[PDB]
Amino acid sequence: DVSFRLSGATSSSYGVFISNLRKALPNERKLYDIPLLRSSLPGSQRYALIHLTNYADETISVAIDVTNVYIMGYRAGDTSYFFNEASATEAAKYVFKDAMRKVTLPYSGNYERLQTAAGKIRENIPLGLPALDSAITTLFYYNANSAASALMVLIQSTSEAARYKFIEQQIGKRVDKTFLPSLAIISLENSWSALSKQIQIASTNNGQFESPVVLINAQNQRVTITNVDAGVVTSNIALLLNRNNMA
Ligand SMILES: NC(=O)C1=CN([C@@H]2O[C@@H](COP(=O)(O)OP(=O)(O)OC[C@@H]3O[C@H](n4cnc5c(N)ncnc54)[C@H](OP(=O)(O)O)[C@@H]3O)[C@H](O)[C@@H]2O)C=CC1
């Protein structure tokens, strides 16, 4: 299991939690020094638990699928909540079995659904440590009306930080303040899948992608990424999704 406590948290301590979470994921091998996630794992090896405690000492435990870093559901006390999707239904057979009640959220875990339910897009939802404290609280005292946006903060502060070093560094830097993510963050989140496939193809094609990927950089310019020498491959992406785990 991996844990993170917000009381006394620093940039450094949030960096240690995201590297511990990366270390908990089994890998096929490495491509360009980047770990390639596994394509299938039995249910007894497939989920990892993260325990998160807020400034008031309130804790939630979150289940993640180690093949794709997707959050399946979470537990607050004796209640478990799972997303409304097939993979989360499979996860419930394996995790939080001793919870007294199980609640199926009315949405699946994807951003187009969550943005809909929150009535707010990702660029106007604050991120940073204090925003994670707040998401913890909201999901511990489950408020149907407030959960989708709390889940987006949760996902971007765990899975998305684990997938990319730039997301991890922007988030960990806000210890006592909050910020709105730029489109460079949103574009990396959007393109994990596509970038992971192209990296795998490039490994058999002298480092060149088969189809370019369009990202948004820090100046807000659209950039066309075509090979493994690009900064995003060399010094940002930290986890690759297996080609068989999209399909
Ligand atoms: N020609 C090419 O380069 C090709 C590329 N692929 C690509 O893959 C397709 C789709 O991939 P997609 O699934 O969009 O991938 P992403 O990289 O965006 O998905 C991976 C992770 O899903 C996010 N995410 C959303 N909800 C959760 C949750 N609950 N827990 C954890 N992570 C979450 C983010 O992006 P997001 O919300 O977007 O999922 C994120 O980086 C594209 O259409 C694209 O083309 C496939 C065929 C061809």
PDB file of C-alpha atoms and ligand atoms in Angstrom:
ATOM      1  CA  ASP A   1       0.000   0.000   0.000  1.00  0.00           C
ATOM      2  CA  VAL A   2       1.310   3.625  -0.402  1.00  0.00           C
ATOM      3  CA  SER A   3       0.301   6.529   1.928  1.00  0.00           C
ATOM      4  CA  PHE A   4       0.361  10.320   1.876  1.00  0.00           C
ATOM      5  CA  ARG A   5      -0.570  12.573   4.837  1.00  0.00           C
ATOM      6  CA  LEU A   6      -1.305  16.327   4.183  1.00  0.00           C
ATOM      7  CA  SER A   7      -0.576  17.541   7.761  1.00  0.00           C
ATOM      8  CA  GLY A   8       3.121  18.657   7.576  1.00  0.00           C
ATOM      9  CA  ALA A   9       3.264  17.991   3.819  1.00  0.00           C
ATOM     10  CA  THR A  10       5.972  19.672   1.752  1.00  0.00           C
ATOM     11  CA  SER A  11       6.860  19.668  -1.948  1.00  0.00           C
ATOM     12  CA  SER A  12       9.467  17.050  -1.149  1.00  0.00           C
ATOM     13  CA  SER A  13       7.095  14.787   0.741  1.00  0.00           C
ATOM     14  CA  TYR A  14       4.587  14.871  -2.157  1.00  0.00           C
ATOM     15  CA  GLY A  15       7.507  13.959  -4.494  1.00  0.00           C
ATOM     16  CA  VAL A  16       8.262  10.969  -2.279  1.00  0.00           C
ATOM     17  CA  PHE A  17       4.594   9.818  -2.401  1.00  0.00           C
ATOM     18  CA  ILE A  18       4.376  10.042  -6.224  1.00  0.00           C
ATOM     19  CA  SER A  19       7.732   8.096  -6.670  1.00  0.00           C
ATOM     20  CA  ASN A  20       6.462   5.446  -4.166  1.00  0.00           C
ATOM     21  CA  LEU A  21       3.285   5.123  -6.266  1.00  0.00           C
ATOM     22  CA  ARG A  22       5.302   4.714  -9.462  1.00  0.00           C
ATOM     23  CA  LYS A  23       7.387   2.004  -7.643  1.00  0.00           C
ATOM     24  CA  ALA A  24       4.227   0.024  -6.754  1.00  0.00           C
ATOM     25  CA  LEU A  25       3.387  -0.566 -10.447  1.00  0.00           C
ATOM     26  CA  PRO A  26       4.835  -3.739 -12.036  1.00  0.00           C
ATOM     27  CA  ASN A  27       6.443  -3.269 -15.419  1.00  0.00           C
ATOM     28  CA  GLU A  28       6.831  -5.382 -18.564  1.00  0.00           C
ATOM     29  CA  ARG A  29      10.273  -3.857 -19.211  1.00  0.00           C
ATOM     30  CA  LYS A  30      11.552  -0.317 -20.029  1.00  0.00           C
ATOM     31  CA  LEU A  31      11.509   1.494 -23.434  1.00  0.00           C
ATOM     32  CA  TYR A  32      13.811   4.505 -23.601  1.00  0.00           C
ATOM     33  CA  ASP A  33      14.233   4.188 -19.824  1.00  0.00           C
ATOM     34  CA  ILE A  34      10.518   4.499 -19.259  1.00  0.00           C
ATOM     35  CA  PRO A  35       8.634   1.627 -17.575  1.00  0.00           C
ATOM     36  CA  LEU A  36       6.108  -0.190 -19.796  1.00  0.00           C
ATOM     37  CA  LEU A  37       3.058  -1.199 -17.731  1.00  0.00           C
ATOM     38  CA  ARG A  38       1.803  -4.821 -17.887  1.00  0.00           C
ATOM     39  CA  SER A  39      -1.019  -5.804 -20.154  1.00  0.00           C
ATOM     40  CA  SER A  40      -2.934  -8.201 -17.971  1.00  0.00           C
ATOM     41  CA  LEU A  41      -2.527  -9.352 -14.320  1.00  0.00           C
ATOM     42  CA  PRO A  42      -4.586 -11.757 -12.241  1.00  0.00           C
ATOM     43  CA  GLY A  43      -7.007 -10.047  -9.902  1.00  0.00           C
ATOM     44  CA  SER A  44      -4.920 -10.797  -6.795  1.00  0.00           C
ATOM     45  CA  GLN A  45      -1.983  -8.804  -8.238  1.00  0.00           C
ATOM     46  CA  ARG A  46      -3.989  -6.122 -10.099  1.00  0.00           C
ATOM     47  CA  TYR A  47      -4.995  -3.371  -7.614  1.00  0.00           C
ATOM     48  CA  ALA A  48      -2.879  -1.289  -5.261  1.00  0.00           C
ATOM     49  CA  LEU A  49      -4.294   0.744  -2.327  1.00  0.00           C
ATOM     50  CA  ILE A  50      -3.326   4.375  -1.574  1.00  0.00           C
ATOM     51  CA  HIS A  51      -4.351   5.828   1.821  1.00  0.00           C
ATOM     52  CA  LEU A  52      -4.725   9.644   1.894  1.00  0.00           C
ATOM     53  CA  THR A  53      -5.235  11.590   5.075  1.00  0.00           C
ATOM     54  CA  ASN A  54      -6.315  15.258   5.175  1.00  0.00           C
ATOM     55  CA  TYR A  55      -5.333  18.061   7.601  1.00  0.00           C
ATOM     56  CA  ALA A  56      -8.149  17.008  10.035  1.00  0.00           C
ATOM     57  CA  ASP A  57      -6.885  13.430  10.113  1.00  0.00           C
ATOM     58  CA  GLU A  58      -9.710  12.174   7.999  1.00  0.00           C
ATOM     59  CA  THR A  59      -8.576   9.295   5.714  1.00  0.00           C
ATOM     60  CA  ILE A  60      -9.901   7.656   2.487  1.00  0.00           C
ATOM     61  CA  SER A  61      -8.256   4.541   0.767  1.00  0.00           C
ATOM     62  CA  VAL A  62      -8.305   4.604  -3.049  1.00  0.00           C
ATOM     63  CA  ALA A  63      -8.059   1.444  -5.309  1.00  0.00           C
ATOM     64  CA  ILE A  64      -6.034   1.748  -8.491  1.00  0.00           C
ATOM     65  CA  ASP A  65      -5.641  -0.771 -11.395  1.00  0.00           C
ATOM     66  CA  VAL A  66      -1.787  -1.142 -11.740  1.00  0.00           C
ATOM     67  CA  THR A  67      -1.974  -1.842 -15.539  1.00  0.00           C
ATOM     68  CA  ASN A  68      -3.367   1.612 -16.420  1.00  0.00           C
ATOM     69  CA  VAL A  69      -3.253   3.744 -13.183  1.00  0.00           C
ATOM     70  CA  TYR A  70      -7.081   4.298 -13.330  1.00  0.00           C
ATOM     71  CA  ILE A  71      -8.833   4.853 -10.044  1.00  0.00           C
ATOM     72  CA  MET A  72     -11.553   2.140  -9.559  1.00  0.00           C
ATOM     73  CA  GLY A  73     -13.271   3.461  -6.366  1.00  0.00           C
ATOM     74  CA  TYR A  74     -12.533   4.504  -2.758  1.00  0.00           C
ATOM     75  CA  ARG A  75     -13.548   3.698   0.777  1.00  0.00           C
ATOM     76  CA  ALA A  76     -14.512   6.121   3.608  1.00  0.00           C
ATOM     77  CA  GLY A  77     -15.065   4.247   6.814  1.00  0.00           C
ATOM     78  CA  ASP A  78     -17.451   1.404   6.239  1.00  0.00           C
ATOM     79  CA  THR A  79     -18.709   2.487   2.872  1.00  0.00           C
ATOM     80  CA  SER A  80     -17.070   1.806  -0.534  1.00  0.00           C
ATOM     81  CA  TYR A  81     -17.799   3.806  -3.719  1.00  0.00           C
ATOM     82  CA  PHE A  82     -17.059   2.448  -7.168  1.00  0.00           C
ATOM     83  CA  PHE A  83     -17.334   4.052 -10.619  1.00  0.00           C
ATOM     84  CA  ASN A  84     -20.141   2.764 -12.925  1.00  0.00           C
ATOM     85  CA  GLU A  85     -18.061   0.782 -15.291  1.00  0.00           C
ATOM     86  CA  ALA A  86     -17.066  -2.869 -16.014  1.00  0.00           C
ATOM     87  CA  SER A  87     -13.497  -2.657 -14.729  1.00  0.00           C
ATOM     88  CA  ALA A  88     -14.719  -1.139 -11.434  1.00  0.00           C
ATOM     89  CA  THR A  89     -17.235  -3.957 -11.190  1.00  0.00           C
ATOM     90  CA  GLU A  90     -14.366  -6.418 -11.522  1.00  0.00           C
ATOM     91  CA  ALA A  91     -12.252  -4.530  -8.920  1.00  0.00           C
ATOM     92  CA  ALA A  92     -15.091  -4.780  -6.335  1.00  0.00           C
ATOM     93  CA  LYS A  93     -14.637  -8.581  -6.312  1.00  0.00           C
ATOM     94  CA  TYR A  94     -11.126  -8.013  -5.057  1.00  0.00           C
ATOM     95  CA  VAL A  95     -10.843  -4.865  -2.893  1.00  0.00           C
ATOM     96  CA  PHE A  96     -12.662  -3.373   0.158  1.00  0.00           C
ATOM     97  CA  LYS A  97     -14.486  -6.627   0.677  1.00  0.00           C
ATOM     98  CA  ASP A  98     -15.156  -5.938   4.312  1.00  0.00           C
ATOM     99  CA  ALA A  99     -17.033  -2.654   3.745  1.00  0.00           C
ATOM    100  CA  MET A 100     -20.647  -2.818   4.997  1.00  0.00           C
ATOM    101  CA  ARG A 101     -22.221  -0.924   2.105  1.00  0.00           C
ATOM    102  CA  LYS A 102     -21.132  -0.444  -1.495  1.00  0.00           C
ATOM    103  CA  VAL A 103     -22.325   2.499  -3.507  1.00  0.00           C
ATOM    104  CA  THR A 104     -22.180   2.641  -7.327  1.00  0.00           C
ATOM    105  CA  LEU A 105     -21.500   6.238  -8.462  1.00  0.00           C
ATOM    106  CA  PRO A 106     -23.762   7.344 -11.339  1.00  0.00           C
ATOM    107  CA  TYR A 107     -20.842   7.933 -13.684  1.00  0.00           C
ATOM    108  CA  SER A 108     -17.828   6.082 -15.048  1.00  0.00           C
ATOM    109  CA  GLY A 109     -14.397   7.497 -14.377  1.00  0.00           C
ATOM    110  CA  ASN A 110     -13.755   9.437 -17.582  1.00  0.00           C
ATOM    111  CA  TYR A 111     -13.303  13.168 -17.710  1.00  0.00           C
ATOM    112  CA  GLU A 112     -16.062  13.829 -20.234  1.00  0.00           C
ATOM    113  CA  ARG A 113     -18.498  12.260 -17.768  1.00  0.00           C
ATOM    114  CA  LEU A 114     -17.037  13.865 -14.631  1.00  0.00           C
ATOM    115  CA  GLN A 115     -16.926  17.396 -16.130  1.00  0.00           C
ATOM    116  CA  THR A 116     -20.659  16.965 -16.978  1.00  0.00           C
ATOM    117  CA  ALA A 117     -21.578  15.881 -13.459  1.00  0.00           C
ATOM    118  CA  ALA A 118     -19.483  18.668 -11.890  1.00  0.00           C
ATOM    119  CA  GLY A 119     -20.767  21.321 -14.282  1.00  0.00           C
ATOM    120  CA  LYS A 120     -17.116  22.717 -14.416  1.00  0.00           C
ATOM    121  CA  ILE A 121     -14.238  21.907 -16.947  1.00  0.00           C
ATOM    122  CA  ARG A 122     -10.777  20.946 -15.725  1.00  0.00           C
ATOM    123  CA  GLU A 123      -9.123  24.331 -16.447  1.00  0.00           C
ATOM    124  CA  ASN A 124     -11.388  26.065 -13.856  1.00  0.00           C
ATOM    125  CA  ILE A 125     -10.954  23.512 -11.075  1.00  0.00           C
ATOM    126  CA  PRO A 126      -8.173  24.414  -8.600  1.00  0.00           C
ATOM    127  CA  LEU A 127      -5.268  22.017  -7.976  1.00  0.00           C
ATOM    128  CA  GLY A 128      -2.518  21.993  -5.330  1.00  0.00           C
ATOM    129  CA  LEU A 129      -2.188  20.451  -1.827  1.00  0.00           C
ATOM    130  CA  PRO A 130      -4.910  22.481  -0.167  1.00  0.00           C
ATOM    131  CA  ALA A 131      -7.270  21.490  -3.065  1.00  0.00           C
ATOM    132  CA  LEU A 132      -6.358  17.801  -2.328  1.00  0.00           C
ATOM    133  CA  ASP A 133      -7.206  18.353   1.420  1.00  0.00           C
ATOM    134  CA  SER A 134     -10.584  19.699   0.281  1.00  0.00           C
ATOM    135  CA  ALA A 135     -11.279  16.747  -2.112  1.00  0.00           C
ATOM    136  CA  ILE A 136     -10.475  14.312   0.671  1.00  0.00           C
ATOM    137  CA  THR A 137     -12.976  16.016   2.892  1.00  0.00           C
ATOM    138  CA  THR A 138     -15.698  16.134   0.304  1.00  0.00           C
ATOM    139  CA  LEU A 139     -15.397  12.411  -0.565  1.00  0.00           C
ATOM    140  CA  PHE A 140     -15.079  11.330   3.176  1.00  0.00           C
ATOM    141  CA  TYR A 141     -18.461  13.107   3.921  1.00  0.00           C
ATOM    142  CA  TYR A 142     -19.768  12.080   0.543  1.00  0.00           C
ATOM    143  CA  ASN A 143     -21.869  14.840  -0.993  1.00  0.00           C
ATOM    144  CA  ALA A 144     -23.327  13.669  -4.233  1.00  0.00           C
ATOM    145  CA  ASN A 145     -23.416  17.271  -5.543  1.00  0.00           C
ATOM    146  CA  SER A 146     -19.778  17.858  -4.887  1.00  0.00           C
ATOM    147  CA  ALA A 147     -18.104  14.561  -5.611  1.00  0.00           C
ATOM    148  CA  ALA A 148     -17.303  14.726  -9.333  1.00  0.00           C
ATOM    149  CA  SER A 149     -15.158  17.758  -9.000  1.00  0.00           C
ATOM    150  CA  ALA A 150     -13.497  16.320  -5.885  1.00  0.00           C
ATOM    151  CA  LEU A 151     -12.786  13.122  -7.907  1.00  0.00           C
ATOM    152  CA  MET A 152     -11.132  15.192 -10.662  1.00  0.00           C
ATOM    153  CA  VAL A 153      -8.761  16.728  -8.152  1.00  0.00           C
ATOM    154  CA  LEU A 154      -8.137  13.255  -6.773  1.00  0.00           C
ATOM    155  CA  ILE A 155      -7.321  11.764 -10.229  1.00  0.00           C
ATOM    156  CA  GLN A 156      -5.091  14.579 -11.353  1.00  0.00           C
ATOM    157  CA  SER A 157      -3.146  14.523  -8.047  1.00  0.00           C
ATOM    158  CA  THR A 158      -2.492  10.751  -8.122  1.00  0.00           C
ATOM    159  CA  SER A 159      -2.691   9.059 -11.463  1.00  0.00           C
ATOM    160  CA  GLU A 160      -1.864  12.065 -13.617  1.00  0.00           C
ATOM    161  CA  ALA A 161       1.058  13.138 -11.459  1.00  0.00           C
ATOM    162  CA  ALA A 162       2.394   9.562 -11.591  1.00  0.00           C
ATOM    163  CA  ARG A 163       2.210   9.525 -15.386  1.00  0.00           C
ATOM    164  CA  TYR A 164       4.088  12.797 -15.951  1.00  0.00           C
ATOM    165  CA  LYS A 165       6.912  14.547 -14.093  1.00  0.00           C
ATOM    166  CA  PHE A 166       5.671  17.987 -15.139  1.00  0.00           C
ATOM    167  CA  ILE A 167       2.244  17.412 -13.546  1.00  0.00           C
ATOM    168  CA  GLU A 168       3.842  16.036 -10.394  1.00  0.00           C
ATOM    169  CA  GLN A 169       6.142  19.176 -10.106  1.00  0.00           C
ATOM    170  CA  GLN A 170       3.392  21.723 -10.763  1.00  0.00           C
ATOM    171  CA  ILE A 171       1.095  20.184  -8.165  1.00  0.00           C
ATOM    172  CA  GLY A 172       3.777  19.552  -5.443  1.00  0.00           C
ATOM    173  CA  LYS A 173       4.866  23.158  -5.720  1.00  0.00           C
ATOM    174  CA  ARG A 174       1.505  24.552  -4.401  1.00  0.00           C
ATOM    175  CA  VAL A 175       1.792  23.634  -0.622  1.00  0.00           C
ATOM    176  CA  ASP A 176      -0.249  26.544   0.863  1.00  0.00           C
ATOM    177  CA  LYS A 177      -1.899  27.926  -2.258  1.00  0.00           C
ATOM    178  CA  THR A 178      -3.964  26.766  -5.267  1.00  0.00           C
ATOM    179  CA  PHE A 179      -3.721  27.197  -9.048  1.00  0.00           C
ATOM    180  CA  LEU A 180      -5.743  26.522 -12.185  1.00  0.00           C
ATOM    181  CA  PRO A 181      -3.997  24.070 -14.572  1.00  0.00           C
ATOM    182  CA  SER A 182      -2.777  25.467 -17.910  1.00  0.00           C
ATOM    183  CA  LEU A 183      -3.704  23.732 -21.184  1.00  0.00           C
ATOM    184  CA  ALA A 184      -0.146  22.129 -21.168  1.00  0.00           C
ATOM    185  CA  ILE A 185      -1.500  20.041 -18.227  1.00  0.00           C
ATOM    186  CA  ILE A 186      -4.825  19.250 -19.861  1.00  0.00           C
ATOM    187  CA  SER A 187      -3.080  18.317 -23.185  1.00  0.00           C
ATOM    188  CA  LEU A 188      -0.693  15.793 -21.452  1.00  0.00           C
ATOM    189  CA  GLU A 189      -3.711  14.254 -19.663  1.00  0.00           C
ATOM    190  CA  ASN A 190      -5.579  14.059 -22.977  1.00  0.00           C
ATOM    191  CA  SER A 191      -2.653  12.410 -24.796  1.00  0.00           C
ATOM    192  CA  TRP A 192      -1.153   9.735 -22.517  1.00  0.00           C
ATOM    193  CA  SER A 193      -2.647   6.914 -24.514  1.00  0.00           C
ATOM    194  CA  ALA A 194      -1.598   8.195 -27.960  1.00  0.00           C
ATOM    195  CA  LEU A 195       1.904   9.089 -26.754  1.00  0.00           C
ATOM    196  CA  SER A 196       2.354   5.627 -25.083  1.00  0.00           C
ATOM    197  CA  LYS A 197       1.346   3.803 -28.367  1.00  0.00           C
ATOM    198  CA  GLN A 198       3.710   5.976 -30.532  1.00  0.00           C
ATOM    199  CA  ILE A 199       6.641   5.369 -28.187  1.00  0.00           C
ATOM    200  CA  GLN A 200       6.139   1.621 -28.480  1.00  0.00           C
ATOM    201  CA  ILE A 201       5.905   1.892 -32.275  1.00  0.00           C
ATOM    202  CA  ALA A 202       8.990   4.102 -32.373  1.00  0.00           C
ATOM    203  CA  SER A 203      11.028   1.349 -30.710  1.00  0.00           C
ATOM    204  CA  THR A 204      10.701  -0.753 -33.909  1.00  0.00           C
ATOM    205  CA  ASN A 205      10.964   2.204 -36.290  1.00  0.00           C
ATOM    206  CA  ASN A 206      14.327   3.820 -35.482  1.00  0.00           C
ATOM    207  CA  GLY A 207      12.814   6.137 -32.857  1.00  0.00           C
ATOM    208  CA  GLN A 208      10.179   7.781 -35.239  1.00  0.00           C
ATOM    209  CA  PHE A 209       6.465   7.817 -34.512  1.00  0.00           C
ATOM    210  CA  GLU A 210       4.044   6.471 -37.082  1.00  0.00           C
ATOM    211  CA  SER A 211       1.467   9.229 -36.411  1.00  0.00           C
ATOM    212  CA  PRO A 212       2.447  12.566 -34.824  1.00  0.00           C
ATOM    213  CA  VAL A 213       0.889  13.746 -31.500  1.00  0.00           C
ATOM    214  CA  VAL A 214      -0.204  17.409 -31.045  1.00  0.00           C
ATOM    215  CA  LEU A 215       0.494  18.839 -27.618  1.00  0.00           C
ATOM    216  CA  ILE A 216       0.100  22.276 -26.045  1.00  0.00           C
ATOM    217  CA  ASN A 217       3.315  23.635 -24.536  1.00  0.00           C
ATOM    218  CA  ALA A 218       3.854  26.242 -21.833  1.00  0.00           C
ATOM    219  CA  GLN A 219       3.581  29.225 -24.220  1.00  0.00           C
ATOM    220  CA  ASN A 220       0.261  27.811 -25.242  1.00  0.00           C
ATOM    221  CA  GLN A 221       1.530  26.914 -28.700  1.00  0.00           C
ATOM    222  CA  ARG A 222       0.255  23.761 -30.475  1.00  0.00           C
ATOM    223  CA  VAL A 223       3.516  21.627 -30.988  1.00  0.00           C
ATOM    224  CA  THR A 224       3.730  18.494 -33.253  1.00  0.00           C
ATOM    225  CA  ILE A 225       5.708  15.693 -31.545  1.00  0.00           C
ATOM    226  CA  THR A 226       7.142  13.042 -33.956  1.00  0.00           C
ATOM    227  CA  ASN A 227       9.882  11.032 -32.290  1.00  0.00           C
ATOM    228  CA  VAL A 228      11.622  10.033 -29.074  1.00  0.00           C
ATOM    229  CA  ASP A 229      14.172  12.865 -29.020  1.00  0.00           C
ATOM    230  CA  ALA A 230      11.258  15.397 -28.124  1.00  0.00           C
ATOM    231  CA  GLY A 231      11.405  16.817 -24.564  1.00  0.00           C
ATOM    232  CA  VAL A 232       8.148  15.201 -23.605  1.00  0.00           C
ATOM    233  CA  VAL A 233       9.630  11.664 -24.148  1.00  0.00           C
ATOM    234  CA  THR A 234      13.057  12.368 -22.831  1.00  0.00           C
ATOM    235  CA  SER A 235      12.244  14.256 -19.653  1.00  0.00           C
ATOM    236  CA  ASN A 236       8.569  14.114 -18.771  1.00  0.00           C
ATOM    237  CA  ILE A 237       6.447  11.055 -19.392  1.00  0.00           C
ATOM    238  CA  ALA A 238       7.130   8.563 -16.596  1.00  0.00           C
ATOM    239  CA  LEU A 239       4.800   5.593 -17.301  1.00  0.00           C
ATOM    240  CA  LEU A 240       3.786   3.991 -20.622  1.00  0.00           C
ATOM    241  CA  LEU A 241       0.351   2.281 -21.133  1.00  0.00           C
ATOM    242  CA  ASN A 242       0.773  -1.098 -22.910  1.00  0.00           C
ATOM    243  CA  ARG A 243      -0.396  -1.119 -26.520  1.00  0.00           C
ATOM    244  CA  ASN A 244      -2.673  -4.054 -25.656  1.00  0.00           C
ATOM    245  CA  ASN A 245      -4.321  -2.109 -22.835  1.00  0.00           C
ATOM    246  CA  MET A 246      -6.116   0.455 -25.005  1.00  0.00           C
ATOM    247  CA  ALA A 247      -6.859  -1.592 -28.049  1.00  0.00           C
TER     248      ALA A 247
HETATM  249  N1  LIG B   1      -2.860   7.894 -34.236  1.00  0.00           N
HETATM  250  C1  LIG B   1      -2.508   7.849 -32.856  1.00  0.00           C
HETATM  251  O1  LIG B   1      -1.587   8.449 -32.234  1.00  0.00           O
HETATM  252  C2  LIG B   1      -3.408   6.929 -32.086  1.00  0.00           C
HETATM  253  C3  LIG B   1      -3.491   7.018 -30.758  1.00  0.00           C
HETATM  254  N2  LIG B   1      -4.319   6.264 -29.889  1.00  0.00           N
HETATM  255  C4  LIG B   1      -4.909   7.189 -28.883  1.00  0.00           C
HETATM  256  O2  LIG B   1      -5.724   6.701 -27.832  1.00  0.00           O
HETATM  257  C5  LIG B   1      -7.141   7.327 -27.882  1.00  0.00           C
HETATM  258  C6  LIG B   1      -7.732   7.477 -26.606  1.00  0.00           C
HETATM  259  O3  LIG B   1      -6.931   7.283 -25.411  1.00  0.00           O
HETATM  260  P1  LIG B   1      -7.499   7.881 -23.966  1.00  0.00           P
HETATM  261  O4  LIG B   1      -8.196   6.734 -23.312  1.00  0.00           O
HETATM  262  O5  LIG B   1      -8.156   9.143 -24.501  1.00  0.00           O
HETATM  263  O6  LIG B   1      -6.194   8.383 -23.135  1.00  0.00           O
HETATM  264  P2  LIG B   1      -5.277   9.189 -22.245  1.00  0.00           P
HETATM  265  O7  LIG B   1      -3.788   9.349 -22.238  1.00  0.00           O
HETATM  266  O8  LIG B   1      -5.859  10.640 -22.071  1.00  0.00           O
HETATM  267  O9  LIG B   1      -5.695   8.330 -20.818  1.00  0.00           O
HETATM  268  C7  LIG B   1      -4.819   8.070 -19.887  1.00  0.00           C
HETATM  269  C8  LIG B   1      -5.177   8.695 -18.574  1.00  0.00           C
HETATM  270  O10 LIG B   1      -6.718   8.863 -18.607  1.00  0.00           O
HETATM  271  C9  LIG B   1      -6.881  10.150 -17.859  1.00  0.00           C
HETATM  272  N3  LIG B   1      -7.917   9.703 -16.760  1.00  0.00           N
HETATM  273  C10 LIG B   1      -9.308   9.935 -16.846  1.00  0.00           C
HETATM  274  N4  LIG B   1     -10.030   9.467 -15.855  1.00  0.00           N
HETATM  275  C11 LIG B   1      -9.192   8.749 -15.075  1.00  0.00           C
HETATM  276  C12 LIG B   1      -9.454   7.973 -13.853  1.00  0.00           C
HETATM  277  N5  LIG B   1     -10.613   7.811 -13.267  1.00  0.00           N
HETATM  278  N6  LIG B   1      -8.275   7.464 -13.250  1.00  0.00           N
HETATM  279  C13 LIG B   1      -7.094   7.587 -13.832  1.00  0.00           C
HETATM  280  N7  LIG B   1      -6.782   8.237 -15.040  1.00  0.00           N
HETATM  281  C14 LIG B   1      -7.856   8.870 -15.634  1.00  0.00           C
HETATM  282  C15 LIG B   1      -6.163  11.013 -18.754  1.00  0.00           C
HETATM  283  O11 LIG B   1      -6.592  11.219 -20.038  1.00  0.00           O
HETATM  284  P3  LIG B   1      -7.987  11.041 -20.872  1.00  0.00           P
HETATM  285  O12 LIG B   1      -9.066  11.659 -20.041  1.00  0.00           O
HETATM  286  O13 LIG B   1      -7.934  11.468 -22.264  1.00  0.00           O
HETATM  287  O14 LIG B   1      -8.148   9.510 -20.861  1.00  0.00           O
HETATM  288  C16 LIG B   1      -4.839  10.293 -18.576  1.00  0.00           C
HETATM  289  O15 LIG B   1      -3.525  10.775 -18.971  1.00  0.00           O
HETATM  290  C17 LIG B   1      -6.909   8.564 -28.820  1.00  0.00           C
HETATM  291  O16 LIG B   1      -8.083   8.787 -29.535  1.00  0.00           O
HETATM  292  C18 LIG B   1      -5.571   8.458 -29.550  1.00  0.00           C
HETATM  293  O17 LIG B   1      -5.557   8.520 -30.795  1.00  0.00           O
HETATM  294  C19 LIG B   1      -5.035   5.277 -30.564  1.00  0.00           C
HETATM  295  C20 LIG B   1      -5.028   5.048 -31.882  1.00  0.00           C
HETATM  296  C21 LIG B   1      -4.200   5.872 -32.833  1.00  0.00           C
END
